[PDB]
Write a new protein. Structure first.
Length: 1016
């Protein structure tokens, strides 16, 4: 039976929200362990029959971009680290090394001669070089979507299986800025047995260390039974560098970083340098080091101790390999032979550490606590909370979500067929997956890299978008053209993509107008794709060169349509106002597209000489004092003008929205009867401190609560149509738009912070919902976690990642804000929600980036706003740490992240065109998604294989029958199935051979992967 994820509160030893409520977070000086205490141990704890086993694990943290680009670091540092690791591990059989970032390792290995490839394979096979995690990168855990965490994990592990014949089962995450339970969720479903984390709040490290709870079985917050649990090691100290990994006193541990004696340009800030180990000092040196090790061991439950030995881009020079290796070997020889220490120390790997810990556990020497929750928001010291990077470089955060969807759609659309090598499908998909995967790095999507590195990530993602477009349009042409007519040129553009929300109106004028005319071209085919596994209707829009356009399906049935002007906003330097201009040569046509599950639907746009029967025209009202005319070319309705005033709008039988005279929402009425519920949007600004620590790309250090943006008398544009209405207003730094299509409104903000230095712009919602101190935010687009706003912590500590949505509720009412981009946000008072839009910061914030954030560019942020009655919903109890979306909020999120794709046929006539693809595909319940569909074999494989990742969310029961759907069996989506297997989520291991070749659907909050084999 499926676990109930709502009604049983798991019993765990440590529940992070409960721990937060209880903890006092006092920042006291703990002595040499600044954020701890003076650790004491009983020397008689170890003896001949109970020794301390110490694993020193050499490592090198290699950022795939940060202060230099990926390729710059590869040429300057990483290729030398890997070349010298190969040499020194080969020559020194007891030395060990771990490696995390497969993007760099693949970059290196493919440039090796065969002789060196063979030597590399041998030091991996014999266990000297060990891959940890084996993702393409070490990803951010706050802003990343779980689908892209899995994508990058799969990209790295598929490479490693192919070329190194290994699949890591231990994860190493020493640098992401706070940690998410989405990681153990994905890793445990991908064969992992152990993971390690580091950047958790210094007060959490102290609290868990005092209880010896730094090693725990980390389960998901809803998991009563514990089947999601993954053994997790949290490192105890302030950094992963050598001063903070040997033991609690960095002034002592720095003396054991043998790269700091001077010739390498490094030194010890605690003013005592390392000394070369010799026969004359090894006993004293070992005394000092073993005492640090035994203090660190006090914080953990077994007699097996992990000592990382590394730092950023370490193990580069041959002289550095020698100075670390030779000095540690001298220490190990002395320590291991001096019975009075009762220690056995050696170089080891991460897996070796975890294997020895679990051998101790099985021998009955330790029992580990259970834990649920997350580790946000991180602070490394004092009040320095790392909530700034939840928003930094928001243009690229939004681009991540656009590319996420494009990769999914290109892999799915092209998976239906096998393609000849000449089509370059696999090549373009590999490039797209790798550039998106690279951006999941903890200096990519986080917005914490130097300006020229951000430009490199953007250029890579632009090439990845172009790759996706090529694959998608080739696939649409093949899926919708009569097979005996299909005659592809794999370099040709049969369709171009039309995307209404990226980069966005006002960000780039990149959309193509469909040009129709009696003397050039009467009509145009367009095609919509729906990547979701259920039938979808959704309004779509295109630019057209006439307002007199009508739409038909490919059975020539008329489709109701609305035409609206194309409005653009200009900051007018002559009048010093922000106001809209309408085009006099292009127009927007909007209509409802109905598209099969995982399918395609074709429509035709036809010009006529006059208003067509099934096309209506929106009215337009410009509210401002001092108006001037707004001609619209051939558009048949004249614009109307008026002074600023409150206005109300309703589309279809949907909610009625009321707006202030400044163009901002004031209330929502859900039904014709019901109350006008206050829901007010407001824009505010945070500044930066003029004394003490400055906000930068990582840190948010506001100078108090936000202050309202002074709005003046902004110009408001109201467009009212049968199918779509909107209110748009030109505010300082934001063109804010509320769009209504008959259900939950859509909000679009065109955010241009301009030259406003030391400013963070926030969008706040004010309501009467009696939420108190509780609010909910998501983790990686996968789950919603309960937050409690703690007044004992500063403002910036109450900011959390908002990777896809947030909500507040009381007994009767909920307000959910869904996002199309990860941003930071909070609820700083009962009834409020707020989300940061952009931040422009002049100073560096002392974490090594060496710049502020002064490279802002206009970005179009998108949202959905769902106000709902929830008193009839079956919700978790007050003690449950999770929350769950309603059906309407989940569908609104899907509308933002995986919209219909739109294709415009590029030539004048499409011969052989077909009207639909996928009409026979099952329309699966609403809580189930086909997150990934990917063909895993090239055309030369006799047995083709297609992989699917199926995710089922959990939606609240609120009494809507909402029913009859068809079972989805992904293993029968392609014909001639010969086998169906359940696999790990990376597709790399078969877990179950399935009866009747049927892939079962999954339980709420579960994710499974299946591979179908076809003998076609
Ligand atoms: C891959 O490793 C497995 C595990 O022992 C081994 O049996 C197999 O032969 C290896 N494949 C090769 C040799 O590349
Ligand atoms: N350890 C530092 C943090 C910075 O953001 C970059 O990821 C470096 O590795
Ligand atoms: Zn890093």
């Amino acid at each position: 039976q499926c676990q109930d994820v709502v009604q049983d509160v798991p019993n765990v030893d440590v529940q992070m929200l409960e721990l937060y409520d209880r903890m006092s977070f006092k920042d006291i000086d703990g002595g040499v362990w600044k954020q701890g205490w003076n650790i004491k141990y009983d020397p008689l704890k170890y003896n001949a029959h109970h020794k301390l086993k110490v694993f020193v694990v050499p490592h090198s943290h290699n950022d795939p971009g940060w202060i230099q680009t990926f390729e710059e670091y590869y040429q300057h540092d990483t290729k030398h680290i890997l070349s010298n690791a190969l040499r020194h591990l080969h020559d020194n059989p007891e030395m060990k090394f771990i490696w995390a970032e497969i993007s760099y390792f693949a970059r290196f290995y493919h440039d090796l001669g065969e002789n060196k490839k063979l030597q590399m394979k041998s030091i991996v096979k014999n266990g000297q070089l060990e891959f940890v995690t084996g993702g393409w990168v070490m990803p951010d855990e706050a802003n990343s979507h779980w689908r892209n965490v899995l994508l990058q994990l799969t990209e790295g592990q598929t490479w490693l299986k192919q070329f190194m014949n290994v699949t890591p089962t231990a994860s190493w995450a020493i640098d992401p800025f706070g940690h998410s339970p989405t990681m153990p969720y994905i890793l445990q479903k991908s064969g992992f047995k152990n993971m390690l984390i580091q950047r958790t709040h210094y007060s959490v490290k102290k609290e868990l260390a005092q209880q010896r709870q730094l090693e725990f079985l980390w389960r998901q917050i809803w998991d009563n039974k514990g089947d999601t649990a993954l053994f997790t090691h949290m490192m105890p100290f302030y950094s992963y560098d050598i001063p903070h990994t040997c033991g609690p006193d960095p002034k002592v541990c720095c003396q054991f970083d043998f790269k700091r004696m001077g010739s390498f340009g490094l030194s010890c800030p605690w003013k005592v340098p390392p000394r070369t180990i010799s026969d004359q000092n090894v006993a004293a040196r070992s005394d000092l080091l073993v005492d640090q090790w035994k203090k660190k061991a006090e914080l953990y439950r077994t007699n097996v101790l992990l000592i990382p030995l590394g730092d950023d881009f370490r193990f580069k020079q041959n002289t550095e390999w020698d100075v670390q290796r030779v000095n540690y070997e001298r220490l190990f020889e002395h320590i291991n032979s001096q019975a009075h220490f009762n220690v056995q120390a050696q170089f080891g790997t991460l897996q070796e550490y975890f294997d020895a810990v679990h051998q101790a556990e099985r021998a009955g020497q330790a029992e580990f606590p259970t834990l649920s929750g997350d580790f946000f928001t991180y602070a490394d010291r004092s009040d320095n909370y790392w909530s700034g990077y939840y928003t930094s470089r928001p243009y690229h955060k939004r681009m991540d979500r656009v590319l996420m969807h494009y990769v999914r759609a290109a892999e799915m659309l092209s998976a239906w067929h096998s393609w000849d090598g000449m089509a370059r499908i696999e090549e373009r998909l590999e490039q797209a997956r790798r550039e998106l995967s690279l951006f999941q790095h903890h200096d990519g999507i986080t917005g914490t890299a130097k300006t020229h590195v951000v430009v490199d990530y953007e250029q890579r993602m632009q090439e990845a978008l172009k790759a996706c477009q090529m694959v998608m349009q080739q696939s649409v042409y093949r899926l919708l053209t009569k097979p005996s007519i299909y005659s592809p040129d794999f370099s040709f553009s049969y369709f171009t993509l039309d995307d209404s929300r990226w980069p966005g109106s006002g960000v780039e004028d990149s959309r193509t107008t469909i040009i129709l005319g009696e003397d050039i071209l009467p009509s145009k085919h367009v095609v919509m794709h729906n990547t979701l596994p259920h039938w979808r209707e959704q309004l779509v829009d295109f630019y057209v060169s006439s307002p007199f356009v009508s739409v038909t399906d490919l059975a020539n049935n008329p489709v109701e349509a609305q035409v609206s002007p194309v409005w653009s906003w200009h900051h007018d330097t002559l009048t010093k106002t922000i106001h809209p201009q309408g085009s006099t040569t292009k127009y927007r046509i909007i209509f409802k597209a109905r598209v099969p599950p995982m399918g395609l639907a074709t429509y035709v746009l036809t010009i006529s000489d006059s208003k067509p029967e099934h096309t209506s025209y929106a009215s337009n009202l410009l509210l401002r004092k001092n108006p001037t005319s707004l001609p619209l070319g051939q558009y048949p309705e004249d614009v109307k003008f008026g002074d600023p005033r409150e206005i109300s709008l309703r589309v279809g039988n949907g909610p009625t929205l009321a707006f202030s005279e400044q163009g901002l929402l004031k209330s929502i009425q859900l039904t014709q009867d019901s109350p006008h519920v206050p829901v007010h949007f407001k824009f505010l600004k945070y500044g930066v401190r003029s004394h003490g620590d400055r906000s930068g790309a990582y840190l948010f250090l506001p100078n108090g609560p936000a202050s309202p943006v002074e709005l003046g008398q902004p110009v408001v544009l109201v467009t009212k149509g049968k199918l779509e209405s909107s209110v748009s207003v030109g505010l300082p730094s934001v063109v804010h738009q509320t769009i209504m299509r008959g259900g939950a409104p859509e909000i679009r903000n065109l955010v241009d912070i301009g030259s406003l230095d030391n400013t963070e712009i926030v969008m706040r919602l004010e309501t009467h919902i009696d939420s108190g101190d509780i609010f909910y935010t998501d983790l990686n687009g996968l789950q919603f976690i309960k937050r409690r706003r703690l007044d004992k912590l500063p403002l910036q500590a109450n900011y959390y990642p908002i990777p896809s949505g947030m909500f507040i509720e009381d007994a009767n009412t909920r307000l959910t804000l869904l996002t199309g981009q990860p941003l930071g946000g909070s609820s700083l008072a009962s009834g409020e929600l707020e989300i940061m839009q952009d931040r422009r910061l002049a100073s560096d914030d002392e974490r090594g980036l060496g710049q502020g954030v002064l490279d802002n560019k206009p970005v179009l942020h998108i949202y959905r706003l769902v106000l709902e009655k929830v008193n009839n919903c079956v919700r978790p109890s007050k003690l449950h740490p999770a929350g769950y979306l309603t059906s309407a909020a989940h569908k609104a999120s899907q509308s933002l992240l995986d919209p219909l794709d739109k294709f415009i046929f590029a030539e004048n006539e499409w011969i052989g065109a077909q009207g639909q693809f996928g009409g026979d595909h099952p329309s699966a319940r609403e809580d189930l998604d086909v997150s990934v569909m990917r063909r895993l074999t090239k055309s030369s494989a006799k047995t083709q294989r297609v992989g699917y990742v199926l995710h089922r969310t959990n939606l609240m029961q609120c009494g809507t029958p909402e029913e009859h759907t068809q079972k989805l069996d992904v293993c029968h989506l392609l014909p001639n199935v010969a086998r169906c297997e359940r696999t790990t989520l990376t597709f790399l291991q078969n877990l179950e051979h399935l009866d009747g070749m049927v892939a079962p659907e999954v339980c709420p909050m579960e994710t499974a992967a299946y591979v179908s084999s076809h003998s076609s």
